[PDB]
Amino acid sequence: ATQWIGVNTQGSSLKNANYDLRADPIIPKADVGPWMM
Amino acid sequence: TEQLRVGPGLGVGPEVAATGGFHQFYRQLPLNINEYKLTQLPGRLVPG
Amino acid sequence: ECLKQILPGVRAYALYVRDASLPFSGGGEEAFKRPELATLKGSKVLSGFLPLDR
Amino acid sequence: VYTPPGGHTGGKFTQDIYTTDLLIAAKDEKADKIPLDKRMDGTFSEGTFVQLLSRGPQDVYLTYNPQISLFKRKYKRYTNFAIENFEERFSTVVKFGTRNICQLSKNGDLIGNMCFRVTLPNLGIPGGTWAPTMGYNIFSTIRMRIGDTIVQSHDRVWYDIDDKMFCDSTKIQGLDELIKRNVTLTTDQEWELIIPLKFFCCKRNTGKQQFLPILNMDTNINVYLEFNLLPLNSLVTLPTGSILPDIQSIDASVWVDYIFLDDTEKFRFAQDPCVYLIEQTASMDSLSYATTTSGQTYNKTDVYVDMKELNKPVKYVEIIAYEQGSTSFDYVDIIESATFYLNSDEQFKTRAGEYFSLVQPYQHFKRSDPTSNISTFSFALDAGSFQPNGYLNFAPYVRTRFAFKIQPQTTPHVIRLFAVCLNWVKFESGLVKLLFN
Amino acid sequence: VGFGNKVSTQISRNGDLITDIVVEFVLTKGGNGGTTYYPAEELLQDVELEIGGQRIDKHYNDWFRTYDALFRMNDDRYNYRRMTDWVNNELVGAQKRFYVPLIFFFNQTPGLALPLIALQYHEVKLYFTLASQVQGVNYNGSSAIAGAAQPTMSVWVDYIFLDTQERTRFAQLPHEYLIEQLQFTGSETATPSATTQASQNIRLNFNHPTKYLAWNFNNPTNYGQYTALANIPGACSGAGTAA
Amino acid sequence: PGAISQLVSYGAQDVYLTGNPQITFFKAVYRRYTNFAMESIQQTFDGTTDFGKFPTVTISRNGDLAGPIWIEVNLPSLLGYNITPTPAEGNTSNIAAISTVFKDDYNNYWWTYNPGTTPQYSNLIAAFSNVDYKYYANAVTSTYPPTALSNVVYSWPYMITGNTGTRSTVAIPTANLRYVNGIGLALFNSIELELGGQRIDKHYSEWWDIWTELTETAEKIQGYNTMVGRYDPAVYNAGWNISQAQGGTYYVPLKFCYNRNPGLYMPLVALSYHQMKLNFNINNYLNCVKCNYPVTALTSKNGANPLSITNMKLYTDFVFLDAPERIRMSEIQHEYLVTQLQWQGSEPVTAPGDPNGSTNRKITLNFNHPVRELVFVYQAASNYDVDAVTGNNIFDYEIPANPTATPPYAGGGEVFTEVKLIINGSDRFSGRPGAYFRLVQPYEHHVRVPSKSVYVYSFALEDADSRQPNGSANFTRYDSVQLQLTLNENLASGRVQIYAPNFNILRIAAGMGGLA
Amino acid sequence: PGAISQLVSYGAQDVYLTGNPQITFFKAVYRRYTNFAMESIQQTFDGTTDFGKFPTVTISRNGDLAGPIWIEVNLPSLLGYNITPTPAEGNTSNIAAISTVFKDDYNNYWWTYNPGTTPQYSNLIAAFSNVDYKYYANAVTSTYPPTALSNVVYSWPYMITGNTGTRSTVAIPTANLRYVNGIGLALFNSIELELGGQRIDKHYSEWWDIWTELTETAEKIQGYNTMVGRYDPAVYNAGWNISQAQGGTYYVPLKFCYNRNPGLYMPLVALSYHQMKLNFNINNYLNCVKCNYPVTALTSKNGANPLSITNMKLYTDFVFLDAPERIRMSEIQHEYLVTQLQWQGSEPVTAPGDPNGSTNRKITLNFNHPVRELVFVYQAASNYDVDAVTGNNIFDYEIPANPTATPPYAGGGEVFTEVKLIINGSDRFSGRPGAYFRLVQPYEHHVRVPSKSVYVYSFALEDADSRQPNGSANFTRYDSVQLQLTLNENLASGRVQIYAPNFNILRIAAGMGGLAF
């Protein structure tokens, strides 16, 4: 699994580093693209 | 071979030799570009 | 993603042990094949003479 | 009022027993037969509407039963790779006048393009100048040795011909700066030369890819580059009374671009056999003069080059002439006409030298003679394409030559013909061998 | 960092919500009292803000000046002046740390705090353009000030740390923030020279519900000069005397 | 004999080249396309279109796919504009159209000819050559028709001063007022492309010139140059006029992946809710002119016009597709392969005596998608400044003259001597000299090698965009990237620009568009 | 570290580039082809091959396909020919091969040198530089050899008048006589290509010039100008003579689709009943030359030869196929997608100062087959005339230097100010300035920008035939088409030559070929 070390949520530069010293709960994601709802 | 000396006409198939004389009839209008920006605002009354 | 690594990995390993075990590929004349000339400068040797049959 | 020609309904072509294929399928399978003349969108010049809907029977070959669009383009996904640049070192001190051998370190999974780098030490002679094109003038011979066998060999003249014949125009000015061609280099300054090596590698040669599968060369089977450099006495011109300071060591290295592959191909190239189509060269010259037993020398009115040592399928040949004594660049046209024989049979009607110089090259690149006097003859529709477009196989022939008709000369010129031929190199079971010799 | 250059920041995600942003400059002035006029925000030529590469707004130094002129009052505008200029008749050589608060949609009140917790795909990035022509620091009018030093710049962001309940809600629930934008392009005046009242009709190009329109007539040479110069005290250099 | 003999002979190698044939070279093959037609249709502007403005243009859905876009710019001729400081020589004056005290006979201009006078016709103002068609100052006259001609009037609206001696005095300006060679590119500092409000790409004045010098084809550069300028420095810095100091129509292409690749023409037929816009950043009129005098007013003689642009009209080349293509485009979701441009700036000093720096510099590279290449250019003189005198020649990627050192050094090339790219703290490759990046990399990868020193490095096997991926480096997985520059010792105090064209995917669905 | 960090962390976005790979860039491949060989075979002409003649060539069925064809033309050097009215100074007189009064010692020409004379050698005629290899007139003498060399003699056959005094008169003729720059193209007014008497295509000298400028690449056009004698006006109009006024062998290509596209090579093996024939139209004797005097005829100094063409040969490159393909070529019918030219001539007054014109001019077009592009060529000047004085320079589609107006106007360019095409009475596109069609259109679509006033307009998307169509306008169904040209006001009257390359289908079967409409 060498290609998977340092991976972000999608191809963006998030400064991955966990700046928030805490839990970071999960954001629900409905796969609705052009117009969210 | 057979030479197909095809002529004037518009919107027709390859089997058609010609349909037009000097001015082919059919044409279509555009859809009026950027129309969505234009709203035709209705009027209102002033109480008066 | 796992099978994409495992499948060529297995193929790669099987070929590895094939070569890691014996010298070269085990191929003989197939591997140790010198180039062919295949020109006709001397395909017909002009035997110097033809003796008579006796 | 009379019935218009063809009828009140526009006249039509009949469907007979001679009409076939597209002239019928185009009408029955016409994809746009269904819309009620509403095919086009709005906002247009009327003439564009007319063009878009004015197809005839002659168009059944172009716009009926479409196969592709010009705009629904697809790209192919490719195996992940990355390129790292490594600098290879010579095993010993690099010197002029000897063969400097560089061993490759097998750093990556494939070898791509290669470039040789050298500086010219500042000899310190204010009146001294170097050779016209040090980028090539120093390289007597360059060979790539792959195990025990040689894949290709090139020398000073071929390299310059290649550039003057297959270097596309937008690159020449930059290349001239790169190899310090058409410039004067003085001996007061230390100059940095960077010289591309036109191997069977990917680019620089109108080629495509042809990567070296370095991983599958086993153990003590490695890649060596043989750089045969001329001695300085032939390279640097000094004024009378100036003594050559000499060079005891040269700062030189080889730049090799190594490609690392995704694991899938990484092992395949290391393990599985691969065969590559390669281009090999040969050099056959003929003197413009002949000598006899008493040692007398006479000029030849008619001089021919015997291509008897060449036994390979040839794509094209390249012809130059130059002064016997001035073994340097800048070629001369001394040929009035030339013709080609196979086993004493004419191959084509004798053509003037201007044909070979100005016309024949149309097939390929650099059909011009601004300063060049390089002429060619092809056996293929194009020379540059990787694809083996065509060739003449010399293997079964016993008496091949180009006969060049010249005016009597006062300068002992030599006419030198190069051939570029196809071969194959196989990388299998740790060994590298050619298919044909 | 430097005069005329462009730098950017990416707001780190150490919290749940962010609200104010304060840009700091440390400047040294090249002239005596009265030479400068809002150098901290002349310098901050503009700030663009985007989320995930999506432009949200952009503010310009002239907007900062126009906004201040319109919307900040008697106590807060003097304090603003204290943060952006020298107000105590300071002399050449004075060095001061300046604070230029930004005026984006989320930083004038907590009610519109920007939810970084809910942006695991997008970064919030700010582009800062620094002016090359800063009155009293690099130039006096059009004349360069020899020896002028580069600024020291830093950008501070105020982060909000929420409890476990609200942190979960902001991360899990969708949000619709009702935000403000600025719309701006440059244009020319038609000021008459003599014996006439010229006029112009300039086409507006705006496209969202608009709270207000505002404008000024600027001398491009002198930042914030929206009126004519005159030999009236405070209305031109040397006003009231022979100079 | 001839070819017939060649066909009869047989070699073993033939079994690998002509045995069991797969293709032939003498049987023409082709594919079929849905009928389409092209039309170049004018777009409108929202906002003012002149120097220093930021107009926006919305590209309307005139066709199904929006292809190439050209901007038509009609600039005035500056040979008639004054420079108020008037350092010398009285600016400019029209000779032929005004000042009717001057008489024109045989195209020769004379002062107040009196028809009743003696054979001494008059004082000569300018002579005209009926074979060269040029005007000459201070021609030799021993007779009415001038004889020997010299001092060519390279600038026709010259100055005349009167009431000095017995006759007025005429002289040719010595200050050549002209447009920056690359005027069609210099005018626009940048153009942004957005769809639905999301920025897709952005070009800069410098990039167009860099891309032209880097990826242009032979025998079109003279055409391209004519359309936007770019007079080669060898003649531009020779002081030419008339051809370099005139207005007229310039044609600026927008070289986006969506403009020069049919497969990426913007599918507006499938974008009913999102329009795309071009956001312009245009220069101030007190720019793009490399004048001999400081330039301050640069304003017309005839009234007071501040060198306004006369016209600006852009055209989008639309394709109109037939019914089956338009139906599939609106119903089927698409993912298009697109290129974005990003760049980074830095400002070295290259040790000017004083302890302000050294020749060892690093630039942090904050790029965000797979990158094709890194392109490095160096702008240092007054050619990054706003001054006209030795300034504003932004397309000047070389070392300036600076004879203010014991050696009166000037120019020389080799802006950078060695560079190495550092990825996450480690070298990606071993260091190579500037010559490698200036000449070898474009010799291998690109269609041309640049004249102006431009340093490139590619992550591709070969590349000029080429309408297909061929290798990239994904900078989203590089947490810290720095490019280390080893600089020369005779550089000025200016800026370095680094450009990085990169990949993304444009998703089209349900009338809306946007990037991943 | 290294490229491994790049290789390994290819990242999420790159999945679209490297996921589920479809091709490899690292495996060189080629396809096996059909054995063939090429032979260059000379064809002969039927009819006199000289000025004003119309010879034909029948291409003999030597091979299976007829490939590229080149015309090899042998022209005399014309400086050996006199201008019959003798405008001035005896245009030419050979001074080396004839007239034994000329003496030659150290390559220096002297008048009647007497070996028994004094140190004053004789009267110098021409000095020779042993380093430059040039002759010089009026050199300074004193020692036996001349000491200072100037007044370079470019045309060797100068004009001499003898026995009038103590020295003969030596003058360099003030008459720079030369072939027009474009002799390679100008010699041939037109050429027809037909199968079985039925014409397929016809090319003109104007098209070959335009097409080469429009569709040729660097380092081929430079050779094109050398073998197809042409010169850039930048040097031709500088007064060059001996460097250009030469005869010898010229090589003119015939750039037909049947000659340029290997796949469209004429399959003569499949055409047993129709022979391919070329019909030539060679220019006239008093044409294709330029001079600074009114030339009415050019004749040899030796004899009365009226500057005839020395020879002319046609070389065709034939393709010979192996048996498998040769059999298929005969037995299987073929349908080729080919191109042909169409044109119409028109000679409007063209907005002259003269009151017989207007700047709003329309030209009605008469094209039918699906057109790939329109090309407009402008010929309105004294260079449209057959005169030798400024005339015959037909390949110069610019505004002439005609100072016959209040301003002494010359050159300038921008022949047309706006161009619009109208189909069926309605615009095909909004009108654009002329520069759009001189610079933008050819830059975007074509291989080369002529950078000479050439106007083009494409109906195809980014091609130059490109061996595959990329769009066309079908004129066969158009009711009427007009080209609207907004003219400049500094134009002379003359021709507007409009070409419209188009597509058609060539059907070959049962040994017969023909064009299908």
**G74 Cβ contact partners less than 8 Å away, ≥ 6 residues apart:** G247, G248, G249, G309, G310, G311, G312, G313
What are the tokens at A34? Answer: 């052009």
Q: Which residue has the tokens 């990868």?
A: F445
- Min Cα–Cα distance to chain F from D135, Å: 14
CA distances from F346 to E11, F482, G249, G505 (A): 21, 12, 60, 61
Q: How far apart are CA G260 and CA G212, in angstroms?
A: 13
From the list D48, D312, E223, the residue with the least C-alpha distance to F35 is: D48
How are beta strands D252-261 and D81-88 bridged, if at all?
antiparallel
Q: How far apart are CA D337 and CA D377, in angstroms?
A: 13
Q: Is the CB of B13 less than 8 angstroms away from the CB of D27?
A: yes
Helix-strand-coil split of chain E, %, nearest 5: 15, 25, 60
In one-letter notation, the amino acid at residue G172 is I
Which chain C positions have a beta carbon within 8 Å of D394's beta carbon?
A: 39
Q: Is the CB of F47 less than 8 angstroms away from the CB of E205?
A: yes
Resolution (A): 3.8
What are the tokens at G279? Answer: 């019909």
F102 forms beta bridges with F111
In one-letter notation, the amino acid at residue F235 is V
Task: Evaluate whether F367 touches F502 at the Cβ level (below 8 Å).
Answer: yes
Q: How far apart are CA G116 and CA G480, in angstroms?
A: 87
- Min Cα–Cα distance to chain F from A13, Å: 5
Between helix F205-215 and helix F221-228 the angle, nearest 10°, is: 160
Task: Provide the H-helix boundaries in G348-465.
Answer: 434-435, 441-445
Q: How far apart are CA D23 and CA G517, in angstroms?
A: 12
Q: How far apart are CA D8 and CA D20, in angstroms?
A: 28
What SS3 state is found at D162?
helix
Q: How far apart are CA F139 and CA F145, in angstroms?
A: 10
Please tell me the total number of residues recorded for chain F in this structure: 516
C30 close contact with F: CB closer than 8 A: no
In one-letter notation, the amino acid at residue B1 is T
Q: Where does residue F97 rank: exposed (0-12), middle (13-18), buried (19+ CB within 10 A)?
A: exposed
E186 close contact with F: CB closer than 8 A: yes
DSSP G103: E
Which chain F positions have a beta carbon within 8 Å of B34's beta carbon?
A: 58, 60
According to the 3-state scheme, what is the secondary structure of F56-92?
EEEECCCCCEEEEEEEEEEECCCCCEECCCCCCCCCC
Task: Evaluate whether G89 touches G175 at the Cβ level (below 8 Å).
Answer: yes
**A9 Cβ contact partners less than 8 Å away, ≥ 6 residues apart:** E120, E121
Residue of chain B nearest D15, judged by CA positions: B15
Residue of chain D nearest G30, judged by CA positions: D387
From the list D319, D289, D284, D314, the residue with the least C-alpha distance to D303 is: D289
What are the tokens at C53? Answer: 């049959």
How are beta strands D139-146 and D149-155 bridged, if at all?
antiparallel
DSSP D59: G
C-alpha G416, offset from chain centre: 24
Q: How far apart are CA G378 and CA G396, in angstroms?
A: 8
Backbone angles phi, psi at F262, to 5 degrees: -50, -35
Residue of chain F nearest D51, judged by CA positions: F37
**D410 Cβ contact partners less than 8 Å away, ≥ 6 residues apart:** none
Residue of chain A nearest G7, judged by CA positions: A3
- The total of other beta-carbon atoms located within 10 Å of residue G475's CB is 23
CA distances from G135 to F487, G106, G120 (A): 55, 12, 21
Backbone angles phi, psi at D396, to 5 degrees: -90, 10
CA distances from D253 to D118, F432, F441, G3 (A): 7, 12, 17, 21
Task: Evaluate whether B17 touches B7 at the Cβ level (below 8 Å).
Answer: yes
Could you tell me the sign of the dihedral formed by the alpha carbons of G476, G480, G486, G490, in that order? positive
**Cα-based torsion angle of the residue sequence F386, F389, F394, F398 in order, rounded to the nearest 10 degrees:** -130
CA distances from G291 to F114, G181, G392 (A): 42, 12, 10
DSSP D436: B
Half-sphere exposure of G303 (CA within 13 A, CB side): 5
CA distances from D375 to D337, D353, D368 (A): 12, 8, 10
What SS3 state is found at D405?
strand
DSSP F439: I
Which chain G positions have a beta carbon within 8 Å of B10's beta carbon?
A: 477
CA angle D131, D135, D141 (to 5 degrees): 95
Q: Is the CB of C35 less than 8 angstroms away from the CB of D434?
A: yes
CA distances from E217 to D430, E72, F259 (A): 81, 20, 39
Q: How far apart are CA G485 and CA E98, in angstroms?
A: 65
Backbone angles phi, psi at F444, to 5 degrees: -75, -45
From the list G166, G172, G130, the residue with the least C-alpha distance to G152 is: G172
How are beta strands G416-423 and G481-487 bridged, if at all?
antiparallel
Q: What is the DSSP string of F201-266?
A: EEEEHHHHHHHHHHHPPTTTHHHHHHHH----HHHHTTT--SSSS--EEEEEE---TTTS-GGGSB
**Cα-based torsion angle of the residue sequence F3, F9, F13, F15 in order, rounded to the nearest 10 degrees:** 90
DSSP G507: E
C-alpha D120, offset from chain centre: 28
What are the tokens at D25? Answer: 């399928």
CA angle G491, G493, G497 (to 5 degrees): 100
Task: Evaluate whether D58 touches G472 at the Cβ level (below 8 Å).
Answer: no
Q: Which residue has the tokens 């159209």?
A: F97
Chain E: partners with 3+ C-beta pairs within 8 Å: A, F
**D282 Cβ contact partners less than 8 Å away, ≥ 6 residues apart:** D309, D310, D312, D418, D419, D421
**F17 Cβ contact partners less than 8 Å away, ≥ 6 residues apart:** D313, D388, D391, D422, G32, G33
The radius of gyration computed from the CA coordinates of chain A, to the nearest angstrom, equals 14
From the list F479, D46, D132, the residue with the least C-alpha distance to G424 is: D46
Task: Evaluate whether D389 touches F25 at the Cβ level (below 8 Å).
Answer: yes
Task: Evaluate whether D388 touches D208 at the Cβ level (below 8 Å).
Answer: no
Task: Evaluate whether G92 touches G242 at the Cβ level (below 8 Å).
Answer: no
For chain F positions 247-286, those within 8 Å of chain C (CB to CB) are none
Q: How far apart are CA E68 and CA E77, in angstroms?
A: 7
- The total of other beta-carbon atoms located within 10 Å of residue F418's CB is 16
Which chain F positions have a beta carbon within 8 Å of G33's beta carbon?
A: 17-18, 21-25
**E201 Cβ contact partners less than 8 Å away, ≥ 6 residues apart:** none
Q: What is the DSSP string of D255-302?
A: EEEEEEE-HHHHHHHHHS-EEEEEEEEEEEEEESEEE-TTS-EEE-SE
Q: Which residue has the tokens 């280390």?
A: F484
From the list D132, D134, D171, the residue with the least C-alpha distance to D252 is: D134
- Min Cα–Cα distance to chain F from B3, Å: 22
Residue F364 is inside which H or E element, if any?
Answer: strand F360-364
Q: How far apart are CA G86 and CA G296, in angstroms?
A: 10
D246 forms beta bridges with none
Chain C: partners with 3+ C-beta pairs within 8 Å: D, F
Residue of chain C nearest F13, judged by CA positions: C38
Q: How far apart are CA G237 and CA G234, in angstroms?
A: 6
Between helix D263-271 and helix C2-21 the angle, nearest 10°, is: 20
Q: What is the DSSP string of E138-186?
A: TEETTEE-TTPPPPEEEEEEEEE---HHHHHHHHHS-------------
Q: How far apart are CA G195 and CA D46, in angstroms?
A: 39
What SS3 state is found at G438?
helix
Which chain F positions have a beta carbon within 8 Å of C36's beta carbon?
A: 12
What are the tokens at G498? Answer: 């409009």
Residue of chain F nearest C40, judged by CA positions: F11
What are the tokens at G450? Answer: 């002529």
Q: How far apart are CA G434 and CA G413, in angstroms?
A: 11
Which chain F positions have a beta carbon within 8 Å of D59's beta carbon?
A: 35
Q: How far apart are CA G442 and CA G450, in angstroms?
A: 8
According to the 3-state scheme, what is the secondary structure of G464-480?
CCCCCCCCCECHHHCCC
From the list G40, G39, G513, the residue with the least C-alpha distance to G277 is: G513
Q: How far apart are CA G484 and CA G358, in angstroms?
A: 12
Q: Which residue has the tokens 């690998």?
A: F16
Q: How far apart are CA E205 and CA F55, in angstroms?
A: 10
Q: How far apart are CA G315 and CA G320, in angstroms?
A: 16
DSSP E118: G
Quick one: residue E195, left, alpha or beta (phi over 0 = left, psi -120 to 50 = alpha)?
A: left
Q: Where does residue F229 rank: exposed (0-12), middle (13-18), buried (19+ CB within 10 A)?
A: buried
Task: Evaluate whether G14 touches D77 at the Cβ level (below 8 Å).
Answer: no
Give the closest of G13, G430, G451 to F226, CB-based. G451
How are beta strands G334-340 and G56-58 bridged, if at all?
unpaired
G190 forms beta bridges with G204, G281
G58 forms beta bridges with G277
Could you tell me the sign of the dihedral formed by the alpha carbons of F96, F101, F105, F109, in that order? negative
Which chain C positions have a beta carbon within 8 Å of F12's beta carbon?
A: 36, 38
B22 close contact with G: CB closer than 8 A: yes
**Cα-based torsion angle of the residue sequence B44, B46, B47, B48 in order, rounded to the nearest 10 degrees:** -140
Q: What is the DSSP string of G318-329?
A: EEEE-HHHHHHH
* Chain A with chain G: Cβ pairs closer than 8 A: 15
G9 close contact with A: CB closer than 8 A: yes
Q: Where does residue D245 rank: exposed (0-12), middle (13-18), buried (19+ CB within 10 A)?
A: middle
Q: How far apart are CA G260 and CA G256, in angstroms?
A: 6
- The total of other beta-carbon atoms located within 10 Å of residue F354's CB is 7
Q: Is the CB of C36 less than 8 angstroms away from the CB of F11?
A: no
Q: Which residue has the tokens 């070969």?
A: F462
Task: Evaluate whether G20 touches G14 at the Cβ level (below 8 Å).
Answer: no
CA distances from D94 to D86, D119, D227, G65 (A): 19, 11, 10, 56
CA angle E43, E48, E53 (to 5 degrees): 150
For chain A positions 10-29, those within 8 Å of chain G (CB to CB) are 10-11
DSSP G148: B
**C20 Cβ contact partners less than 8 Å away, ≥ 6 residues apart:** none
Q: How far apart are CA G13 and CA G5, in angstroms?
A: 16
